[model samples]
Target: SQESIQNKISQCKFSVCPERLQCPLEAIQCPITLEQPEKGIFVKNSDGSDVCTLFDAAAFSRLVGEGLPHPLTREPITASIIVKHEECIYDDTRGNFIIKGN
Candidate 1:
């Protein structure tokens, strides 16, 4: 599914979203992007086994909020996923965090 979501990032349009979602993450910012946020921001659902939700932000959104849509595809985008692929985490209140540096 990672490969599928990774491929969807390039096929999306620009927009925040129509509905307000209560995800485990918040205040997400991208340093390299043209606009950066003041702070940054999720979690995995645990039933029996532990799993993680990972995806390329934009593409994942396109595929989730909508689909692996063709340019001419009339389908709508109603799903969303946001993953911070870089940097590290210190606050464990949300649980253990990991990044490339340390």
Candidate 2:
């Protein structure tokens, strides 16, 4: 699951850091393009137990107002795990996300 996401991030030729590293006017400047926010941004816990959600920005309508994707941009993207192939916390005995969210 996270494997492909890491692959996509590594393959991107542009700036890996999307919003934070960008100019303040970047998001509101003009029509959004591929250059605009190509990287998947997210924050994870220190011990790697779970991911944190920080999607408290613009509303759904504002994204569509720019003719950009609504659900595509609204979803929370968790950071990839890169410790090692063995670092993955895979388990078949139980489900991971017991909360309302995943």
Candidate 3:
């Protein structure tokens, strides 16, 4: 059963990085690992790319406070991760939250 769950993501078509220049598919730059408590994590896939954005438990927990049906709330929710990545502003609003990563 667990293997099947793992397989879903393990078999993802865009499992690898989008391109060498794009961000890699790895752990989010946060203290919480994906499998933690009071926790949640989700991937926001960039259209046409494997460089899907990843979030860690600690990061997204900080966001849920912003609530659902709220995209603007996500901006600040993701801003901290941006800072952690040493990145400037980025689009977190344009992707699906694949729960397998959660």
Candidate 4:
């Protein structure tokens, strides 16, 4: 089963756009420090349907308080949700981590 394969791979598992103030082309690990740990920022669509993207704290600050178009969906972003509470999952297909807001 794929699940069984995943279970084994999990033991060794480790670990994109532009225009109109887009997110970084690459997934950047949030900087970790003794005082400040990594936190993800969630950008939500104005229609309240979906989260636009999860950005690092530093990147989010640059686009804060502005109606920027989503990097992936091109939807209008109305709110910036600072996710102090969240979770992360590894997506093997995408070969990246998905940061989920709790």
Candidate 5:
């Protein structure tokens, strides 16, 4: 007879602030709406951390240039590191992007 051991993993709820609300300075002038695609915006911080915002494709397309600072962190980011958020989902009820957990 063989004995088997079972391992249980704990599940927790994690929440993140809305991308539109992430940058208070740009909230009024440029707010990322729920109508926009969930995976449109891409952001990379100077400290090597990267995240996705809710900025629309049109807005990001217009801002793709040299010396453009990240709206939320105000960290210098380059066009090379810009990419779409694949694992994000737009929750219309909550009006925010819900990132999936691994």
Candidate 6:
């Protein structure tokens, strides 16, 4: 499949540069890589926009100050994960936090 592989490479050799292209949206940019994400992120807002997943205190406050409702539950989300990709949880038995994934 060398011919087919070379054909694909040839198409990309002169493709539009990702650096020259603007980020589709601030929220959609990969938080870890800072590269534009193709699928975008999600955060539910009060006004029904369902946006705002940035790492800003003001932005979080705006979205949760009045207690924004959690999409899956009637309860409001009471926490925020600014930038860390790992999932953090407390293990009462171990008396320490447990982190998983990156």
Provide TM-scores for the models.
0.22, 0.21, 0.25, 0.33, 0.36, 0.25
- lDDT (Cα, tens digit) per residue for candidate 6, span 34-102: 454433222323243223332223233333445554433344444332222223332355443333334
After superposition, candidate 1 runs with Cα above 4 Å error:
1-48, 67-102
Candidate 2 residue 22 C-alpha distance from true site, Å: 12
**Backbone clashes (count) for model 6:** 0
What clash pairs does model 3 have?
A: none
List RMSD in Å for every model shown: 13.1, 15.4, 12.7, 14.8, 15.3, 19.1
Q: Highest TM-score among the candidates is held by which one?
A: 5
Roughly what TM-score does model 6 have, to 2 decimal places?
0.25
**lDDT tens string, model 1, 18-37?**
13322233233232232322
Query: Model 4, poorest ten-residue lDDT window?
Result: 12-21
Candidate 3 Cα RMSD (Å) = 12.7
Error of 4 at 15 (Å): 16
Error of 2 at 68 (Å): 21
* Order by TM-score, highest first: 5, 4, 6, 3, 1, 2
35 Cα displacement, candidate 3 (Å): 17
lDDT of 4 by residue, 2-96 (tens): 33322322232222112322324334333222122144443433244432234544433433334344444554433232222233433455454
lDDT of each: 0.32, 0.31, 0.31, 0.35, 0.38, 0.33
Displacement of the residue 90 alpha carbon in candidate 6, Å? 24
Candidate 2: RMSD to truth: 15.4
Q: What's the lDDT of the predicted structure labeled candidate 2?
A: 0.31
lDDT of 5 by residue, 1-102 (tens): 001100000011112234654533232223434343332354323243333454544444444333345555665444444433444444455464444454
lDDT of 6 at 51: 33
Lowest summed lDDT across 10 adjacent residues in model 3 is found at 80-89
List candidate 2 stretches off by more than 4 Å: 16-24, 28-73, 76-102
- Give the worst 10-residue stretch by lDDT in candidate 6: 8-17
List runs of model 5 lying over 4 Å from the truth.
Answer: 1-52, 78-85, 90-95
